Design a protein around this ligand. Sequence first.
Ligand SMILES: CC(C)(COP(=O)(O)OP(=O)(O)OC[C@H]1O[C@@H](n2cnc3c(N)ncnc32)[C@H](O)[C@@H]1OP(=O)(O)O)[C@@H](O)C(=O)NCCC(=O)NCCS
Ligand SMILES: CC(C)(COP(=O)(O)OP(=O)(O)OC[C@H]1O[C@@H](n2cnc3c(N)ncnc32)[C@H](O)[C@@H]1OP(=O)(O)O)[C@@H](O)C(=O)NCCC(=O)NCCS
Ligand SMILES: CC(C)(COP(=O)(O)OP(=O)(O)OC[C@H]1O[C@@H](n2cnc3c(N)ncnc32)[C@H](O)[C@@H]1OP(=O)(O)O)[C@@H](O)C(=O)NCCC(=O)NCCS
Ligand SMILES: [Mg+2]
Ligand SMILES: [Mg+2]
Ligand SMILES: [Mg+2]
Lengths: 123, 123, 123
Amino acid sequence: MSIIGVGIDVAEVERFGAALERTPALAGRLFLESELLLPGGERRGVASLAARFAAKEALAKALGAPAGLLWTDAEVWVEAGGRPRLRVTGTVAARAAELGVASWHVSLSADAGIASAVVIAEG
Amino acid sequence: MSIIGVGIDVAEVERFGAALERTPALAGRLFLESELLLPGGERRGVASLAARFAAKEALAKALGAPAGLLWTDAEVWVEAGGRPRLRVTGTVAARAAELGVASWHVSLSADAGIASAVVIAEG
Amino acid sequence: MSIIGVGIDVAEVERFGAALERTPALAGRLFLESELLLPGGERRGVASLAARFAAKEALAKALGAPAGLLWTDAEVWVEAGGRPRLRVTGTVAARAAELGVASWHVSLSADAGIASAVVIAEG
Ligand SMILES: CC(C)(COP(=O)(O)OP(=O)(O)OC[C@H]1O[C@@H](n2cnc3c(N)ncnc32)[C@H](O)[C@@H]1OP(=O)(O)O)[C@@H](O)C(=O)NCCC(=O)NCCS
Ligand SMILES: CC(C)(COP(=O)(O)OP(=O)(O)OC[C@H]1O[C@@H](n2cnc3c(N)ncnc32)[C@H](O)[C@@H]1OP(=O)(O)O)[C@@H](O)C(=O)NCCC(=O)NCCS
Ligand SMILES: CC(C)(COP(=O)(O)OP(=O)(O)OC[C@H]1O[C@@H](n2cnc3c(N)ncnc32)[C@H](O)[C@@H]1OP(=O)(O)O)[C@@H](O)C(=O)NCCC(=O)NCCS
Ligand SMILES: [Mg+2]
Ligand SMILES: [Mg+2]
Ligand SMILES: [Mg+2]
């Protein structure tokens, strides 16, 4: 395998929260129901959602951000240990196949009012 | 292939703009003429230039930042879809050859007053 | 080889410094004696220490952050040219072996009140 793409994204947390508040429908456009919940069932907070938004932007960048990708066709899920993972379906999986992507790597971080993500596509 | 190096850089946009304003010659020292223009021919803005500066710093870091690298020997170019790409020549290409680098991967992001870049060298 | 994990971390410098000041023992819990010194023997500054903290957090993330990792089992050392490098021992090396990690790549950056690091584990 080789690296197919890398993506990075930085998202200002306060601004992201404001966008979610302004348009009730936005959260459901960006996130699957599972992503909006913490492991124990409570509602995921704004900084953690901003990090997932950054991850999806970074994933899109790693794929060359073509038209027609759906936010809901990329899913951030969480291993028991807390580690974030990417699962791709539909439009995102189709684009990944065009480029020969077999494996996805992600990491997330938030501090100082920002959320960040890096994504590497490999295949 | 294997990873040869990784680089990351974060640049404060306002400070970068101030540096460009202070010394008229600076932009031409850091950037090729093509980098200073948007696809349609207008002048590239300060945040986008800061992201390209970060990319060049990150590229230097991925190569172990030896003396003698020229800023103008690394070029950020743009695919039709908008995706940034690195082209290396001269001093930067020579150092890349010393290390066996065959392929370059870059991503850029700006928000919250900062521009950022990640670069991976592979070979 | 393939990518085994990636980590990113962003650390607010001022807050990190405040934590070090609040608990005298903290620096020695996070850092080996060598990490606390500059090449010439003077004391390493807070932003540079924050970048090393971010590197260790990013390394932990690349390994899936299991319980039992010691901060002192990851060491940031510096090549003559200034390039940062990771050396792993003990608990961190043991976890790396569980995952098959052969090679480590790191880069550090600080600006705009933040320190950042990216780490890639390969094997
Ligand atoms: C292009 C895009 C990915 C980045 O936009 P953004 O997060 O608002 O802005 P950022 O500052 O973080 O990133 C902008 C940088 O992305 C890079 N970029 C632009 N188009 C790109 C593309 N087609 N592929 C990869 N990178 C691209 C550029 O370097 C740009 O900076 P520049 O114009 O100064 O060179 C975004 O506008 C977009 O089209 N998002 C699509 C997301 C998506 O499809 N999601 C559904 C599936 S998860
Ligand atoms: C070393 C350099 C790359 C980073 O400087 P910077 O962007 O101003 O500062 P940042 O905070 O972003 O990065 C500093 C970190 O880079 C790392 N670094 C220093 N020397 C390095 C080197 N030789 N190789 C890789 N990384 C290096 C260090 O970890 C340092 O932090 P630390 O001293 O606390 O450990 C920069 O000073 C430099 O020499 N730039 C050269 C650019 C160049 O050659 N361009 C032309 C070709 S594109
Ligand atoms: C999990 C941890 C790595 C990140 O915490 P942090 O730096 O305070 O917080 P950040 O915002 O930077 O990162 C949090 C993100 O890390 C990710 N994360 C959580 N658990 C993780 C794990 N087991 N593996 C990889 N990533 C993990 C998550 O995506 C989380 O964000 P989310 O909850 O919104 O999804 C940290 O809490 C930790 O346990 N550190 C261990 C360090 C260590 O073991 N050091 C000694 C050896 S060097
Ligand atoms: Mg963005
Ligand atoms: Mg820098
Ligand atoms: Mg952190």
